[PDB]
Amino acid sequence: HKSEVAHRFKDLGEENFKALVLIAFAQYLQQCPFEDHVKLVNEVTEFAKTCVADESAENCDKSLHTLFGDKLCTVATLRETYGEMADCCAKQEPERNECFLQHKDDNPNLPRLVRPEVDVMCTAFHDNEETFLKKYLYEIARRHPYFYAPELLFFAKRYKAAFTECCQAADKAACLLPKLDELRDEGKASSAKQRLKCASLQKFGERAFKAWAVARLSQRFPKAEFAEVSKLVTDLTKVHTECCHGDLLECADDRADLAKYICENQDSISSKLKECCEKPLLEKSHCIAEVENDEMPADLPSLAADFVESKDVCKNYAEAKDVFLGMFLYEYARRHPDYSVVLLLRLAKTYETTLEKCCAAADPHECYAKVFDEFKPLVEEPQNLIKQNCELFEQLGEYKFQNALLVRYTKKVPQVSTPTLVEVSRNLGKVGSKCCKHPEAKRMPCAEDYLSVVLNQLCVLHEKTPVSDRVTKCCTESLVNRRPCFSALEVDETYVPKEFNAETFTFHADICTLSEKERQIKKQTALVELVKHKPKATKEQLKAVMDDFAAFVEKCCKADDKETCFAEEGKKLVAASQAALG
Numbered sequence: 001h002k003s004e005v006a007h008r009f010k011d012l013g014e015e016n017f018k019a020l021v022l023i024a025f026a027q028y029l030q031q032c033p034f035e036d037h038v039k040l041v042n043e044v045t046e047f048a049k050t051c052v053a054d055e056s057a058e059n060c061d062k063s064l065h066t067l068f069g070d071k072l073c074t075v076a077t078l079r080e081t082y083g084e085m086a087d088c089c090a091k092q093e094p095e096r097n098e099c100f101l102q103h104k105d106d107n108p109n110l111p112r113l114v115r116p117e118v119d120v121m122c123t124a125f126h127d128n129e130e131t132f133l134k135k136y137l138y139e140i141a142r143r144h145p146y147f148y149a150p151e152l153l154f155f156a157k158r159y160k161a162a163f164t165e166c167c168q169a170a171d172k173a174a175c176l177l178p179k180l181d182e183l184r185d186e187g188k189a190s191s192a193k194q195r196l197k198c199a200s201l202q203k204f205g206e207r208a209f210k211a212w213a214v215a216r217l218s219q220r221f222p223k224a225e226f227a228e229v230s231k232l233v234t235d236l237t238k239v240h241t242e243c244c245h246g247d248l249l250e251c252a253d254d255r256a257d258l259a260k261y262i263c264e265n266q267d268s269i270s271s272k273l274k275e276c277c278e279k280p281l282l283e284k285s286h287c288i289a290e291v292e293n294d295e296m297p298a299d300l301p302s303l304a305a306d307f308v309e310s311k312d313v314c315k316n317y318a319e320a321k322d323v324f325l326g327m328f329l330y331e332y333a334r335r336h337p338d339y340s341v342v343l344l345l346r347l348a349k350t351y352e353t354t355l356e357k358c359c360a361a362a363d364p365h366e367c368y369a370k371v372f373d374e375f376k377p378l379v380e381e382p383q384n385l386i387k388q389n390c391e392l393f394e395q396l397g398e399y400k401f402q403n404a405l406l407v408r409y410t411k412k413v414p415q416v417s418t419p420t421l422v423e424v425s426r427n428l429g430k431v432g433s434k435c436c437k438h439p440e441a442k443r444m445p446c447a448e449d450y451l452s453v454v455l456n457q458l459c460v461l462h463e464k465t466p467v468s469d470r471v472t473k474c475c476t477e478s479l480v481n482r483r484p485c486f487s488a489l490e491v492d493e494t495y496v497p498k499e500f501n502a503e504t505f506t507f508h509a510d511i512c513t514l515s516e517k518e519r520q521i522k523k524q525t526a527l528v529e530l531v532k533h534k535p536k537a538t539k540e541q542l543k544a545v546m547d548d549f550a551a552f553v554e555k556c557c558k559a560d561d562k563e564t565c566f567a568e569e570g571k572k573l574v575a576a577s578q579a580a581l582g
């Protein structure tokens with residue numbers, strides 16, 4: 001009351017307050033030294049302490065955004081570091097924060113993190129343990145500006161536990177890398193997942209996220225009531241709205257309240273929350289967000305009884321057009337847990353469109369009576385796509401599956417930059433190794449919910465530099481229909497060939513001097529360049545040049561001495577390929 005910062009300090013505490021302010025500062029001013037961020041956080045914490053000690057102190061009743069902006073731009077006073085940012089904080093709330101959000105670089109030009117030796121890492125750990133953990137938050141926060149802040153506090157705790165457990169014992173080297181690598185891959189998957197949730201609130205509105213939350217939570221929490229699911233959805237939407245507009249202090253405070261409420265009303269929500277609700281505060285919310293789907297309630301009546309066979313459907317729709325569709329989404333999702341969340345949203349939109357033109361055109365009960373008949377093609381379209389791709393995946397392997405997707409997606413949109421095409425196809429091919437081994441029931445909720453994340457990552461890296469018109473049309477037209485739009489484009493008859501570049505196929509030594517993961521990009525980039533060279537003459541039989549590439553690589557890999565072999569066989573191979581018109 002009368003002091004939001006004091007209330008946040010009292011709720012979160014001292015350790016979480018200082019960590020949640022460092023993340024906020026690092027996610028805004030990405031190209032800034034660590035020491036300045038530490039000083040700013042210390043000043044903010046001291047001001048919060050002074051306002052806590054005496055309520056009627058110097059002015060501290062203003063909102064957190066005002067203090068955030070004042071400490072942000074009225075103290076740093078850097079203009080050359082961030083362009084067009086000097087005039088950013090000339091407006092008032094809430095226009096200042098909106099201007100600040102648009103300057104967050106999704107892919108900043110920062111050096112890749114390199115891990116020192118274990119001995120040096122744990123020598124620095126047990127020298128400034130408080131400061132050593134603060135640097136971990138800074139780098140992750142500045143490299144992922146949209147990373148979920150309350151989830152970043154869990155990762156720091158796991159980092160501290162991993163460092164404490166291993167190198168205060170024998171075999172320091174082979175204890176830390178296995179566990180640190182788990183965090184790195186777990187942190188890159190929870191940052192791309194939040195980006196999809198965070199770009200669906202500021203591009204498609206709050207109503208888009210509410211329907212997603214209703215569909216997802218009804219699947220995870222069946223046998224509950226619509227009143228409870230609505231409350232959970234409202235709380236979740238309020239939580240995720242604040243983390244997207246920079247209110248990290250309030251976002252982490254509201255998440256704890258939601259977790260506490262879920263644990264309190266455990267019997268009325270789900271029976272699988274017994275274990276997740278006996279964990280520490282930072283682990284309860286993580287466990288709840290990933291709890292498994294509860295068992296379906298027994299003897300559920302058919303949905304056709306009160307949605308298509310009753311002469312009040314359009315009357316109820318006209319009474320309230322946003323809760324009637326909420327009930328349909330809730331009832332159709334609880335009894336169909338094998339559908340992806342984006343499919344259920346598609347069927348809900350189809351049902352809404354059918355109802356729109358039925359009660360406003362002559363007899364109503366003549367065109368929405370068979371609305372369930374047109375759900376079949378929508379259901380069968382992605383079931384006939386996962387089935388073929390998983391079969392194709394388990395006949396070529398991971399590396400050859402990524403190449404197959406890379407060639408397919410290069411002909412569809414042959415204008416995106418080669419690094420973006422290579423990166424998206426590498427992530428596209430990793431859904432085969434992820435959950436093509438699941439049973440047919442669980443294949444759909446996993447595959448499409450990951451394809452959505454990958455395609456959103458494709459869209460956000462294309463908005464800054466829009467080069468392809470087809471990508472723009474599929475990205476900024478509908479969130480749910482993003483995947484069907486991409487898997488509906490034929491080969492592009494436009495995009496006259498990129499001509500021939502001699503320097504492209506000039507593999508000179510290296511290749512066989514470093515690890516295998518990053519040498520694959522050296523060949524996938526060449527494949528992308530080859531496909532763009534001949535977009536039309538891209539039949540399957542002329543793509544046998546991959547075998548020649550592999551043979552040429554192997555011949556000089558086993559004969560690394562006299563590195564002129566690389567150039568000689570490279571020019572011979574490119575001449576042979578050009579002579580074959582392929």
Ligand SMILES: CCCCCCCC(=O)O
Binds near residue numbers: 157158160
């Ligand atoms: C990767 C290590 C997992 C440990 C979880 C956190 C334990 C603690 O710090 O209390």
Ligand SMILES: CCCCCCCC(=O)O
Binds near residue numbers: 214322346
């Ligand atoms: C895209 C689905 C539209 C109908 C569901 C409405 C539920 C909600 O908005 O909370």
Ligand SMILES: CCCCCCCC(=O)O
Binds near residue numbers: 258286288289
């Ligand atoms: C119950 C507390 C946890 C919910 C907030 C985060 C869930 C999500 O990532 O969607």
Ligand SMILES: CCCCCCCC(=O)O
Binds near residue numbers: 157280281282
């Ligand atoms: C248990 C209350 C402490 C608040 C968060 C600190 C991490 C944790 O132990 O969950």
Ligand SMILES: CCCCCCCC(=O)O
Binds near residue numbers: 385405428451487
């Ligand atoms: C289980 C699906 C494997 C990858 C699908 C991507 C292909 C496409 O979008 O056309």
